[PDB]
Amino acid sequence: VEKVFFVTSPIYYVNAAPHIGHVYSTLITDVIGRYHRVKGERVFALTGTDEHGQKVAEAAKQKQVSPYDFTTAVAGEFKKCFEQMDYSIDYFIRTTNEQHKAVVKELWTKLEQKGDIYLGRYEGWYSISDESFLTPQNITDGVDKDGNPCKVSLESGHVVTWVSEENYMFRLSAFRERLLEWYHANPGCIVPEFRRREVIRAVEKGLPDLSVSRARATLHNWAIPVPGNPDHCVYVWLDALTNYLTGSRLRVDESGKEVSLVDDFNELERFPADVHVIGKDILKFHAIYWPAFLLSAGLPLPKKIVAHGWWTKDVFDPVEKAEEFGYDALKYFLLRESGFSDDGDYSDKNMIARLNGELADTLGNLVMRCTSAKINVNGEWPSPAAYTEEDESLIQLIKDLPGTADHYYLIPDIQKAIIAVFDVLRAINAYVTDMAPWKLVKTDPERLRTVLYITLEGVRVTTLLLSPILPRKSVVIFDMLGVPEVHRKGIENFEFGAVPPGTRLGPAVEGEVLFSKRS
Ligand code: MET
């Protein structure tokens, strides 16, 4: 299928200012989308804000402001944060958007028409902060904002309240077997594997029907009305999930403004998403509810959901840390340190260790060596002579790197991808140290040609595969190496030897620093 590669992030509640967590989830989305662009693929990356609901309404009230004013303000904060963070997201959707509201009504009507929505009651627990329905097995004892007894969610520890309302119910129970068939027929669809196992376990125990409307008073009328029943408002999560479907049907300005909503998702060739990036805290909504709505509506299911280890929505300001330590470096650190396990050492100490250790010493030092006037005296890419077995062994590593990094990026496990690239980087260092090209300038010019060219090409290819992570710094590196633009993207330039000998390096600004060491 030739289609637009469609990668999304969650859309974040606007009850508070954007923080780390939002920046991480969108960072992952950004990176995946950036990697597919360097492969020369069509990409559409989506991010945005979740603006309706009781949670947000009550946050706006607590600040003595109108919901319209409050969502617009916080959303603007989110837009400023993501711009400052230097992403490359193709569109920023808001659920207050009028074109979005129309897709929600369409989808609602489609589910109703398919027979999958009936009027019933929900009587049970609810976490307003998580906008989540919970069974009694999922709550426990706690304390409110005053030490007063109360019940909280096991999931998140937020206060839960009992709800007894006549609600429109979605027939989630009817989709249990079809979802299990989906999980098993596509064992890559949920990443990492242990979260794929969790979802299956849960669906296997059985599924209750899901409330998809609420009484309009309860939401403070800050919500999308149920089509043909203005007493009710569409559940914030059904509303929220439809974000993905909406964004797949929006034609976008050259300045990121929606200008048109197309009738049919096929028209823009984006739906269904090839990867949903989410945090572990919103797995049920994306891996159970979402495909059930889509199976009901006759729509196509996503290909991959990847749930990382952070808590999506919840001492570290992203922009200030990036001002201190560097943007690409901060992004690199976040991506390198965490797996699907949120047990990352995020201290200033470990940030500096990785900055100095890997960015400055492994990669930075290596770039400076092969470009320096000491070693590379003609400031160009040499023609290599004959390769020795040690030469060939390093070359093999470089030739194998792209296919390996590619598979990691596609899982997606971006940490593993970085580790693979830096293994090759550590090897190239060991080769350089072994060959001592600095001594070779004098002793053996022909030998140097070989060592230097292999060093250049290794640095080029690692840098290319590192470019979705270090997008500003890779441009600097390519500039230093003198790599023509056309060679900076495309799978054509994954191949060893795509930049010809004789290519001149780019001027030198000997106020160096690729990465300046710290503390
Ligand atoms: C459809 S993504 C919804 C995510 C939710 N608004 C959150 O912030 O966790």
Short mmCIF file of C-alpha atoms and ligand atoms in Angstrom, two decimals:
data_model
loop_
_atom_site.label_atom_id
_atom_site.label_comp_id
_atom_site.label_asym_id
_atom_site.label_seq_id
_atom_site.Cartn_x
_atom_site.Cartn_y
_atom_site.Cartn_z
CA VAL A 1 0.00 0.00 0.00
CA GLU A 2 1.31 3.36 -1.02
CA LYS A 3 -0.23 5.61 1.50
CA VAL A 4 0.68 8.50 3.68
CA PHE A 5 2.47 7.26 6.74
CA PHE A 6 0.23 8.41 9.54
CA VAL A 7 1.64 8.77 13.01
CA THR A 8 -0.18 10.39 15.96
CA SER A 9 0.36 11.47 19.55
CA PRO A 10 -2.29 11.63 22.14
CA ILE A 11 -4.27 14.85 22.40
CA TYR A 12 -3.67 16.28 25.85
CA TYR A 13 -6.21 17.58 28.40
CA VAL A 14 -5.95 21.36 28.71
CA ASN A 15 -6.68 21.50 32.45
CA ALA A 16 -3.10 22.63 33.03
CA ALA A 17 -0.02 23.93 31.27
CA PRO A 18 2.04 21.66 29.02
CA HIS A 19 4.89 19.83 30.71
CA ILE A 20 7.38 17.02 30.31
CA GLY A 21 5.24 14.04 29.43
CA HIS A 22 3.36 15.90 26.77
CA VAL A 23 6.68 16.87 25.29
CA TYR A 24 7.90 13.28 25.52
CA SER A 25 4.89 11.72 23.87
CA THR A 26 4.94 14.23 21.07
CA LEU A 27 8.70 13.89 20.75
CA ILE A 28 8.26 10.18 20.02
CA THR A 29 5.57 10.93 17.49
CA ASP A 30 7.82 13.54 15.95
CA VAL A 31 10.84 11.20 15.71
CA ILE A 32 8.98 8.32 14.10
CA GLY A 33 7.49 10.72 11.59
CA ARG A 34 10.90 12.26 10.92
CA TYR A 35 12.52 8.90 10.29
CA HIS A 36 9.95 8.01 7.66
CA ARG A 37 10.58 11.28 5.94
CA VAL A 38 14.30 10.59 5.62
CA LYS A 39 13.29 7.29 3.99
CA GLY A 40 11.53 9.51 1.46
CA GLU A 41 8.05 8.47 2.54
CA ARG A 42 4.96 10.68 2.65
CA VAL A 43 4.27 11.51 6.27
CA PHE A 44 1.45 13.05 8.28
CA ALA A 45 2.18 13.54 11.97
CA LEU A 46 -0.59 14.63 14.31
CA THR A 47 -0.74 16.26 17.74
CA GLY A 48 -3.26 18.40 19.62
CA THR A 49 -5.48 19.06 22.62
CA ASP A 50 -8.47 17.43 24.30
CA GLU A 51 -10.69 20.32 25.21
CA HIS A 52 -14.11 19.13 26.27
CA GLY A 53 -15.26 17.18 29.26
CA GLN A 54 -15.96 17.53 32.95
CA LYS A 55 -12.29 17.50 33.88
CA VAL A 56 -11.43 20.51 31.74
CA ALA A 57 -14.68 22.31 32.50
CA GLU A 58 -14.08 22.05 36.22
CA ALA A 59 -10.50 23.22 35.80
CA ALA A 60 -11.73 26.28 33.92
CA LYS A 61 -14.27 26.99 36.62
CA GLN A 62 -11.66 26.64 39.28
CA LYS A 63 -9.85 29.43 37.57
CA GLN A 64 -12.88 31.61 37.35
CA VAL A 65 -12.86 31.73 33.58
CA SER A 66 -15.07 30.73 30.68
CA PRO A 67 -14.34 27.31 29.15
CA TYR A 68 -13.97 28.86 25.66
CA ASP A 69 -11.40 31.32 27.01
CA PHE A 70 -9.59 28.75 29.09
CA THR A 71 -9.22 26.06 26.49
CA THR A 72 -8.07 28.63 23.94
CA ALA A 73 -5.48 30.00 26.35
CA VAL A 74 -3.97 26.65 27.42
CA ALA A 75 -4.07 25.31 23.91
CA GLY A 76 -2.09 28.35 22.88
CA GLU A 77 0.42 27.51 25.59
CA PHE A 78 0.70 23.98 24.21
CA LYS A 79 1.27 25.39 20.72
CA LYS A 80 3.99 27.67 21.96
CA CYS A 81 5.66 24.83 23.83
CA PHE A 82 5.69 22.52 20.84
CA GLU A 83 7.05 25.26 18.59
CA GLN A 84 9.82 26.10 20.97
CA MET A 85 10.63 22.41 21.17
CA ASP A 86 11.30 22.50 17.44
CA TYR A 87 9.21 19.53 16.35
CA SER A 88 8.00 18.93 12.83
CA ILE A 89 4.36 18.03 13.42
CA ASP A 90 2.17 18.48 10.35
CA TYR A 91 -0.97 19.58 12.18
CA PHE A 92 -2.21 20.57 15.63
CA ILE A 93 -5.86 19.60 16.13
CA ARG A 94 -8.23 20.92 18.79
CA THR A 95 -11.41 19.10 19.69
CA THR A 96 -13.30 22.40 19.82
CA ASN A 97 -12.70 22.67 16.11
CA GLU A 98 -15.97 22.78 14.24
CA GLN A 99 -14.79 20.24 11.62
CA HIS A 100 -13.89 17.81 14.34
CA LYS A 101 -17.32 18.16 15.93
CA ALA A 102 -18.82 17.10 12.64
CA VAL A 103 -16.76 13.93 12.39
CA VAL A 104 -17.84 12.99 15.92
CA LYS A 105 -21.52 13.37 15.01
CA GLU A 106 -20.96 11.31 11.85
CA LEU A 107 -19.28 8.54 13.77
CA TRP A 108 -21.92 8.60 16.47
CA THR A 109 -24.68 8.30 13.88
CA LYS A 110 -22.81 5.47 12.16
CA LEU A 111 -22.52 3.49 15.39
CA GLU A 112 -26.18 4.17 16.18
CA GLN A 113 -27.20 3.09 12.70
CA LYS A 114 -25.15 -0.09 12.97
CA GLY A 115 -27.18 -1.07 16.02
CA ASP A 116 -24.47 -0.56 18.56
CA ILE A 117 -25.79 2.23 20.74
CA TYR A 118 -28.76 1.87 23.08
CA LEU A 119 -30.20 3.85 25.96
CA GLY A 120 -29.26 2.38 29.31
CA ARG A 121 -27.92 3.28 32.74
CA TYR A 122 -24.42 3.36 34.11
CA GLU A 123 -24.28 2.88 37.85
CA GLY A 124 -20.72 2.75 39.07
CA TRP A 125 -17.47 4.49 39.81
CA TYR A 126 -15.85 7.17 37.70
CA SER A 127 -12.56 9.02 37.80
CA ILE A 128 -13.17 12.56 36.61
CA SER A 129 -9.46 13.19 36.35
CA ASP A 130 -8.98 10.16 34.10
CA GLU A 131 -12.36 10.53 32.49
CA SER A 132 -12.57 6.82 33.13
CA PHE A 133 -15.16 4.27 34.21
CA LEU A 134 -13.89 1.87 36.84
CA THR A 135 -15.20 -1.39 38.27
CA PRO A 136 -15.15 -1.80 42.05
CA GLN A 137 -12.13 -4.10 41.66
CA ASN A 138 -10.23 -1.01 40.45
CA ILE A 139 -10.69 1.36 43.34
CA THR A 140 -9.44 1.44 46.91
CA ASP A 141 -9.32 3.70 49.91
CA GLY A 142 -7.64 7.08 49.99
CA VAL A 143 -8.04 10.75 50.90
CA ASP A 144 -9.35 13.82 49.09
CA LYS A 145 -7.69 17.23 49.08
CA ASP A 146 -8.29 17.32 52.80
CA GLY A 147 -7.37 14.28 54.79
CA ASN A 148 -10.87 12.99 54.59
CA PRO A 149 -11.64 9.42 53.89
CA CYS A 150 -12.55 8.58 50.36
CA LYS A 151 -12.12 6.25 47.49
CA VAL A 152 -9.47 6.48 44.79
CA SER A 153 -8.57 4.72 41.59
CA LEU A 154 -6.01 1.91 41.62
CA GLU A 155 -5.03 3.02 38.10
CA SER A 156 -4.03 6.57 39.02
CA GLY A 157 -4.82 7.30 42.64
CA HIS A 158 -7.17 10.13 41.76
CA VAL A 159 -10.47 10.59 43.57
CA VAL A 160 -13.37 8.58 42.21
CA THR A 161 -17.06 9.34 42.45
CA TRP A 162 -20.20 7.27 42.08
CA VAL A 163 -22.35 7.98 39.05
CA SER A 164 -25.93 6.87 38.42
CA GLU A 165 -27.17 8.21 35.13
CA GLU A 166 -29.26 7.28 32.17
CA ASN A 167 -26.61 7.03 29.46
CA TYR A 168 -26.32 5.99 25.87
CA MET A 169 -24.39 2.72 25.97
CA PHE A 170 -22.04 1.31 23.31
CA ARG A 171 -22.19 -2.47 22.86
CA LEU A 172 -18.56 -3.11 23.72
CA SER A 173 -19.41 -6.58 24.95
CA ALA A 174 -20.33 -7.60 21.42
CA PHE A 175 -16.81 -6.95 20.16
CA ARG A 176 -14.79 -9.07 22.56
CA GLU A 177 -14.25 -12.02 20.25
CA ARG A 178 -13.54 -9.80 17.24
CA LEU A 179 -10.91 -7.89 19.23
CA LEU A 180 -9.26 -11.10 20.41
CA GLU A 181 -9.13 -12.21 16.76
CA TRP A 182 -7.49 -8.90 15.96
CA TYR A 183 -4.81 -9.14 18.70
CA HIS A 184 -3.80 -12.61 17.59
CA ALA A 185 -3.92 -12.14 13.86
CA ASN A 186 -1.64 -9.15 14.31
CA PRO A 187 0.89 -9.86 17.06
CA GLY A 188 2.77 -6.65 16.35
CA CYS A 189 -0.21 -4.32 16.80
CA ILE A 190 0.50 -3.38 20.42
CA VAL A 191 4.02 -2.53 21.57
CA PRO A 192 5.79 -3.47 23.93
CA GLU A 193 4.85 -7.11 24.05
CA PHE A 194 3.97 -7.18 27.72
CA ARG A 195 1.34 -4.48 27.23
CA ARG A 196 0.01 -6.46 24.32
CA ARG A 197 -0.30 -9.31 26.76
CA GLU A 198 -2.08 -7.13 29.33
CA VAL A 199 -4.78 -6.00 26.92
CA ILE A 200 -5.48 -9.56 25.76
CA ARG A 201 -5.75 -10.80 29.34
CA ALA A 202 -8.27 -8.08 30.07
CA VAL A 203 -10.39 -8.56 27.00
CA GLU A 204 -10.37 -12.27 27.66
CA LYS A 205 -11.93 -11.86 31.13
CA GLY A 206 -14.87 -10.26 29.29
CA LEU A 207 -16.08 -6.75 28.39
CA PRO A 208 -18.95 -4.63 29.78
CA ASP A 209 -20.85 -2.15 27.60
CA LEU A 210 -19.45 1.32 27.57
CA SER A 211 -21.23 4.52 28.43
CA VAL A 212 -20.71 6.95 25.55
CA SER A 213 -23.03 9.77 26.58
CA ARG A 214 -23.53 11.72 29.77
CA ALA A 215 -26.26 13.98 31.17
CA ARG A 216 -25.59 17.51 29.94
CA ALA A 217 -25.64 19.06 33.38
CA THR A 218 -22.83 16.86 34.66
CA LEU A 219 -20.39 18.14 32.03
CA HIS A 220 -21.36 21.77 32.61
CA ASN A 221 -22.54 21.73 29.02
CA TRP A 222 -18.98 21.75 27.78
CA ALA A 223 -19.20 18.94 25.24
CA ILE A 224 -20.62 17.81 21.89
CA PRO A 225 -24.37 17.08 21.97
CA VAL A 226 -25.59 13.61 21.10
CA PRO A 227 -27.12 13.79 17.62
CA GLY A 228 -30.87 13.97 18.09
CA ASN A 229 -30.78 14.03 21.87
CA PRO A 230 -29.69 17.42 23.19
CA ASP A 231 -30.17 16.25 26.77
CA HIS A 232 -26.99 14.24 26.40
CA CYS A 233 -23.42 15.02 25.56
CA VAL A 234 -20.99 12.66 23.78
CA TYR A 235 -18.53 10.99 26.19
CA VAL A 236 -15.29 12.92 26.15
CA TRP A 237 -13.29 9.81 25.15
CA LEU A 238 -15.35 8.91 22.12
CA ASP A 239 -15.07 12.57 21.20
CA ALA A 240 -11.33 12.48 21.94
CA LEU A 241 -10.49 9.29 20.04
CA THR A 242 -12.19 10.64 16.90
CA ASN A 243 -9.36 13.19 16.75
CA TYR A 244 -7.39 10.65 14.72
CA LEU A 245 -10.15 10.19 12.15
CA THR A 246 -10.72 13.90 11.89
CA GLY A 247 -7.08 14.75 11.34
CA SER A 248 -6.95 12.18 8.60
CA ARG A 249 -9.61 14.14 6.69
CA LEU A 250 -8.24 17.65 7.01
CA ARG A 251 -6.53 19.46 4.17
CA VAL A 252 -4.01 21.78 5.74
CA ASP A 253 -2.68 25.25 4.91
CA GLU A 254 0.91 26.00 4.30
CA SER A 255 0.76 27.55 7.75
CA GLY A 256 -0.91 24.69 9.51
CA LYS A 257 -4.43 25.94 9.43
CA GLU A 258 -7.23 23.59 8.59
CA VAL A 259 -8.96 24.70 5.49
CA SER A 260 -11.17 21.80 4.47
CA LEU A 261 -12.77 18.60 5.73
CA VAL A 262 -13.01 15.84 3.11
CA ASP A 263 -15.98 13.47 2.94
CA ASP A 264 -14.06 10.23 2.82
CA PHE A 265 -10.80 9.36 4.57
CA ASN A 266 -9.45 7.58 1.48
CA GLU A 267 -9.20 10.92 -0.21
CA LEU A 268 -6.10 11.98 1.74
CA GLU A 269 -4.78 8.41 2.13
CA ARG A 270 -3.86 8.81 5.81
CA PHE A 271 -6.36 6.66 7.72
CA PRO A 272 -5.87 4.40 9.65
CA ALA A 273 -2.85 5.47 11.63
CA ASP A 274 0.20 3.40 11.13
CA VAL A 275 1.33 4.22 14.67
CA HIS A 276 -0.55 5.63 17.66
CA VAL A 277 1.95 6.92 20.24
CA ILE A 278 0.43 6.87 23.75
CA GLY A 279 1.44 6.58 27.37
CA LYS A 280 0.67 3.48 29.43
CA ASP A 281 -2.14 5.24 31.21
CA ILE A 282 -4.46 5.40 28.22
CA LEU A 283 -4.01 1.94 26.83
CA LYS A 284 -7.55 0.66 27.27
CA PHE A 285 -9.02 3.56 25.30
CA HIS A 286 -6.75 2.95 22.27
CA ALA A 287 -6.47 -0.84 22.34
CA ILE A 288 -10.00 -1.80 23.34
CA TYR A 289 -12.53 1.04 22.86
CA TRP A 290 -11.05 2.61 19.73
CA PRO A 291 -10.87 -0.57 17.64
CA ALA A 292 -14.34 -1.51 18.79
CA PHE A 293 -15.76 1.82 17.58
CA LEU A 294 -13.88 1.30 14.30
CA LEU A 295 -15.09 -2.29 13.89
CA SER A 296 -18.62 -1.08 14.49
CA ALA A 297 -18.36 1.79 12.09
CA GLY A 298 -16.89 -0.31 9.33
CA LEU A 299 -13.60 1.59 9.48
CA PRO A 300 -10.01 0.22 9.26
CA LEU A 301 -8.05 -0.44 12.44
CA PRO A 302 -4.67 1.08 13.22
CA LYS A 303 -1.55 -0.95 12.50
CA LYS A 304 0.40 -0.24 15.66
CA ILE A 305 -0.27 1.22 19.08
CA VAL A 306 2.95 1.86 21.01
CA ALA A 307 2.57 2.60 24.72
CA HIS A 308 5.64 4.09 26.35
CA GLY A 309 6.51 4.14 30.04
CA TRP A 310 5.64 7.66 31.08
CA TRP A 311 2.37 8.76 32.61
CA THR A 312 0.96 10.83 29.66
CA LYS A 313 -0.79 13.34 31.91
CA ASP A 314 0.57 12.95 35.40
CA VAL A 315 11.28 18.58 38.57
CA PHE A 316 11.73 19.34 34.99
CA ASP A 317 10.78 22.05 32.56
CA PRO A 318 11.46 20.89 29.00
CA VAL A 319 12.21 24.32 27.51
CA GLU A 320 14.48 25.51 30.31
CA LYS A 321 16.41 22.23 30.30
CA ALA A 322 16.78 22.62 26.55
CA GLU A 323 18.04 26.15 26.97
CA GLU A 324 20.65 24.99 29.46
CA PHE A 325 21.78 21.70 27.86
CA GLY A 326 20.67 22.01 24.23
CA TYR A 327 17.61 21.04 22.24
CA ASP A 328 18.83 18.07 20.24
CA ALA A 329 20.79 16.96 23.27
CA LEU A 330 17.78 17.04 25.55
CA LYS A 331 15.72 15.17 22.99
CA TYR A 332 18.51 12.68 22.60
CA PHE A 333 18.77 12.17 26.34
CA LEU A 334 15.06 11.56 26.83
CA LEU A 335 15.02 9.07 24.00
CA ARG A 336 18.19 7.24 25.04
CA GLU A 337 17.50 6.99 28.74
CA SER A 338 13.98 5.53 28.83
CA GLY A 339 12.63 2.24 27.59
CA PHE A 340 9.16 1.07 28.04
CA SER A 341 9.69 1.30 31.76
CA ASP A 342 9.91 4.90 32.98
CA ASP A 343 12.75 3.94 35.32
CA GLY A 344 15.14 6.46 33.93
CA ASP A 345 17.78 8.32 35.85
CA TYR A 346 16.75 11.86 34.85
CA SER A 347 19.24 13.62 37.10
CA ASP A 348 21.40 16.50 35.96
CA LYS A 349 24.28 14.15 36.66
CA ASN A 350 23.21 11.52 34.20
CA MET A 351 22.28 14.06 31.56
CA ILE A 352 25.80 15.44 31.70
CA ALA A 353 27.26 11.97 31.62
CA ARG A 354 25.42 11.13 28.41
CA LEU A 355 26.11 14.51 26.91
CA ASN A 356 29.84 14.27 27.59
CA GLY A 357 30.14 10.54 27.22
CA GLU A 358 28.21 9.91 24.07
CA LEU A 359 27.45 13.17 22.26
CA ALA A 360 30.72 14.97 22.86
CA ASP A 361 33.20 12.09 23.28
CA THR A 362 31.86 9.41 20.99
CA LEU A 363 30.16 11.41 18.21
CA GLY A 364 31.44 14.97 18.61
CA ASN A 365 35.09 13.96 18.89
CA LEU A 366 34.73 11.65 15.91
CA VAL A 367 33.33 14.34 13.66
CA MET A 368 36.08 16.75 14.55
CA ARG A 369 38.82 14.15 13.91
CA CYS A 370 37.87 13.32 10.34
CA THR A 371 37.36 16.97 9.44
CA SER A 372 40.34 18.52 11.22
CA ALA A 373 43.06 20.12 9.11
CA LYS A 374 45.60 18.03 11.01
CA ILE A 375 44.33 14.68 9.65
CA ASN A 376 42.25 15.66 6.62
CA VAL A 377 44.80 18.02 5.12
CA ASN A 378 43.08 18.47 1.76
CA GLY A 379 39.67 19.02 3.35
CA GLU A 380 37.95 16.50 1.10
CA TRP A 381 36.76 12.93 0.81
CA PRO A 382 39.83 10.86 -0.18
CA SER A 383 39.77 7.97 -2.62
CA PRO A 384 40.30 4.78 -0.63
CA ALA A 385 43.07 2.34 -1.51
CA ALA A 386 42.74 -1.37 -0.84
CA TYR A 387 40.88 -2.44 2.25
CA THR A 388 42.42 -4.61 4.96
CA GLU A 389 40.43 -7.17 6.96
CA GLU A 390 40.03 -4.72 9.82
CA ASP A 391 38.86 -2.14 7.29
CA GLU A 392 36.35 -4.60 5.87
CA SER A 393 35.06 -5.49 9.32
CA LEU A 394 34.21 -1.93 10.15
CA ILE A 395 32.66 -1.45 6.72
CA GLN A 396 30.52 -4.50 7.27
CA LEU A 397 29.21 -2.94 10.46
CA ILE A 398 28.38 0.27 8.65
CA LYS A 399 26.68 -1.57 5.81
CA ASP A 400 24.59 -3.56 8.24
CA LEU A 401 23.60 -0.61 10.42
CA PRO A 402 20.76 0.82 8.30
CA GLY A 403 18.79 -2.41 8.08
CA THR A 404 19.18 -2.90 11.80
CA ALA A 405 18.24 0.62 12.81
CA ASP A 406 15.38 0.44 10.35
CA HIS A 407 13.84 -2.54 12.11
CA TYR A 408 14.15 -0.85 15.47
CA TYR A 409 12.56 2.37 14.24
CA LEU A 410 9.71 0.31 12.80
CA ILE A 411 8.96 -1.61 15.97
CA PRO A 412 9.10 1.26 17.21
CA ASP A 413 11.88 1.08 19.77
CA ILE A 414 13.79 4.31 19.30
CA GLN A 415 16.08 3.61 22.25
CA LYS A 416 17.27 0.41 20.62
CA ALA A 417 17.77 2.32 17.38
CA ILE A 418 20.04 4.87 19.08
CA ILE A 419 22.01 2.17 20.87
CA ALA A 420 22.60 0.40 17.55
CA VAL A 421 23.87 3.54 15.92
CA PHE A 422 26.19 4.33 18.78
CA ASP A 423 27.61 0.81 18.80
CA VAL A 424 28.83 1.53 15.29
CA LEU A 425 30.04 4.89 16.51
CA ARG A 426 32.07 3.28 19.29
CA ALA A 427 33.52 0.85 16.74
CA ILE A 428 34.57 3.62 14.38
CA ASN A 429 36.33 5.24 17.33
CA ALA A 430 38.18 2.07 18.15
CA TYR A 431 39.22 1.83 14.52
CA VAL A 432 40.51 5.39 14.45
CA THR A 433 42.41 4.96 17.71
CA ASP A 434 43.84 1.75 16.32
CA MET A 435 44.95 3.25 13.02
CA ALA A 436 46.17 6.53 14.48
CA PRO A 437 45.49 8.52 11.27
CA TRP A 438 47.35 11.48 12.75
CA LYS A 439 50.63 9.55 12.59
CA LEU A 440 49.65 8.35 9.11
CA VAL A 441 49.75 11.80 7.54
CA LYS A 442 53.52 11.56 7.72
CA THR A 443 54.17 7.80 7.48
CA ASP A 444 51.68 6.53 4.90
CA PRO A 445 49.55 8.93 2.82
CA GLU A 446 47.92 6.13 0.79
CA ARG A 447 46.92 4.26 3.96
CA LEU A 448 45.44 7.46 5.42
CA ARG A 449 43.23 7.89 2.37
CA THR A 450 41.58 4.62 3.31
CA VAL A 451 41.22 5.17 7.02
CA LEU A 452 39.91 8.67 6.48
CA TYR A 453 37.34 7.72 3.89
CA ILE A 454 35.98 4.91 6.00
CA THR A 455 35.80 7.28 8.94
CA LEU A 456 33.94 9.86 6.88
CA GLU A 457 31.41 7.38 5.52
CA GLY A 458 30.76 5.80 8.90
CA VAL A 459 30.17 9.21 10.46
CA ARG A 460 27.90 10.08 7.55
CA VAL A 461 25.76 6.97 7.77
CA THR A 462 25.46 7.01 11.57
CA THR A 463 24.57 10.69 11.34
CA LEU A 464 21.89 10.04 8.74
CA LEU A 465 20.22 7.40 10.91
CA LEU A 466 20.66 9.68 13.89
CA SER A 467 18.98 12.60 12.13
CA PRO A 468 15.46 12.01 13.41
CA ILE A 469 16.88 12.40 16.91
CA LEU A 470 19.42 15.15 16.35
CA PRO A 471 17.77 17.11 13.54
CA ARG A 472 19.67 20.38 13.97
CA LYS A 473 22.98 18.80 14.85
CA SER A 474 22.83 16.38 11.92
CA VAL A 475 22.57 19.31 9.56
CA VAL A 476 25.64 20.85 11.14
CA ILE A 477 27.48 17.55 10.79
CA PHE A 478 26.52 17.04 7.20
CA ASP A 479 27.59 20.66 6.55
CA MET A 480 30.98 20.00 8.08
CA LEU A 481 31.37 16.85 6.04
CA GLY A 482 30.22 18.76 2.97
CA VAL A 483 27.44 16.34 2.15
CA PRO A 484 25.26 17.55 -0.73
CA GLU A 485 21.58 18.00 0.23
CA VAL A 486 20.31 15.21 -1.99
CA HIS A 487 22.45 12.80 -0.05
CA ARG A 488 20.90 13.74 3.26
CA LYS A 489 17.73 11.74 2.80
CA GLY A 490 16.39 8.79 0.89
CA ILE A 491 17.09 5.09 1.26
CA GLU A 492 19.42 5.48 -1.66
CA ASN A 493 21.80 7.12 0.75
CA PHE A 494 21.58 4.40 3.34
CA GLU A 495 24.10 2.55 1.12
CA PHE A 496 27.80 2.58 1.84
CA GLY A 497 29.61 4.95 -0.50
CA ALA A 498 26.88 7.28 -1.77
CA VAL A 499 29.01 10.40 -1.41
CA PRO A 500 31.81 10.39 -3.95
CA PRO A 501 35.50 10.95 -3.23
CA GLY A 502 36.61 14.48 -4.09
CA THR A 503 33.67 16.04 -2.27
CA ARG A 504 34.92 19.07 -0.38
CA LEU A 505 34.28 19.56 3.31
CA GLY A 506 32.30 22.55 4.36
CA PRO A 507 34.02 25.61 5.66
CA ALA A 508 35.40 25.58 9.15
CA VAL A 509 34.10 27.84 11.89
CA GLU A 510 36.75 27.02 14.42
CA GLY A 511 34.63 28.26 17.22
CA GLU A 512 33.96 24.55 17.14
CA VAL A 513 31.64 22.75 19.53
CA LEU A 514 29.41 20.14 18.07
CA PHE A 515 28.63 19.50 21.68
CA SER A 516 30.52 21.44 24.34
CA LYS A 517 31.29 19.38 27.44
CA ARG A 518 29.73 20.43 30.76
CA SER A 519 30.38 20.51 34.56
C1 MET B 1 -7.45 10.28 22.30
S1 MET B 1 -6.02 10.73 23.26
C2 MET B 1 -6.80 11.29 24.78
C3 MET B 1 -5.76 11.51 25.84
C4 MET B 1 -6.28 12.24 27.08
N1 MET B 1 -6.92 13.51 26.68
C5 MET B 1 -5.12 12.53 28.02
O1 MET B 1 -4.62 13.65 28.15
O2 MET B 1 -4.66 11.59 28.66
#
